[PDB]
């Protein structure tokens, strides 16, 4: 879109010397300005994860690919978090059988919805948390 412009700006914040590549040391600089203090090994891992051609640095195409996947994955997370908030009527961080039942009609019996909860209820507390919800929605 015109989001490439925004991605170029973000890239330019990493590419401190404007050579069109992001090095481990430039990434290091960025992360310390955000209040993190990564090791050289941690930095290398992060570069390696994005470095499609294995040349040891991140060019703008590599960065753009990474940003587009991160944005899709961020958009998805947010969609699932919104769905979860809709179910979690009382905002307690768990979906009850009662909340699932309400939502699910808008006609299931307590027994039928208990069954749905149990299927999703990895930790056995008889409710569905966000982590369990993500599992159920993405599997």
């Amino acid at each position: 879109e015109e989001q490439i412009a925004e991605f170029k700006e973000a890239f330019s914040l990493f590419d401190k010397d404007g050579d069109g590549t992001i090095t481990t040391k430039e990434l290091g600089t960025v992360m310390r300005s955000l209040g993190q203090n990564p090791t050289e090994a941690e930095l290398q891992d992060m570069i390696n994860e994005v470095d499609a051609d294995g040349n040891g640095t991140i060019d703008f195409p590599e960065f753009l690919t990474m940003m587009a996947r991160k944005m899709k994955d961020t958009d998805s997370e947010e969609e699932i978090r919104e769905a979860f908030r809709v179910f979690d009527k009382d905002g307690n961080g768990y979906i009850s059988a009662a909340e699932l039942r309400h939502v699910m009609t808008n006609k299931l019996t307590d027994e039928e919805v208990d069954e749905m909860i149990r299927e999703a209820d990895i930790d056995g507390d008889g409710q569905v948390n966000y982590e369990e919800f993500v599992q159920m929605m993405t599997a």
């Binding site: 969609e79 919104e82 769905a83 809709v86 699910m104 749905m116 159920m136 929605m137």
Partner: peptide, 15 residues
């Protein structure tokens, strides 16, 4: 039924 949830979410989202 998770399908039904995915579909109705897709239709009634961002209200």
């Amino acid at each position: 039924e998770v399908c039904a949830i995915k579909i109705q979410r897709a239709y009634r989202r961002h209200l």
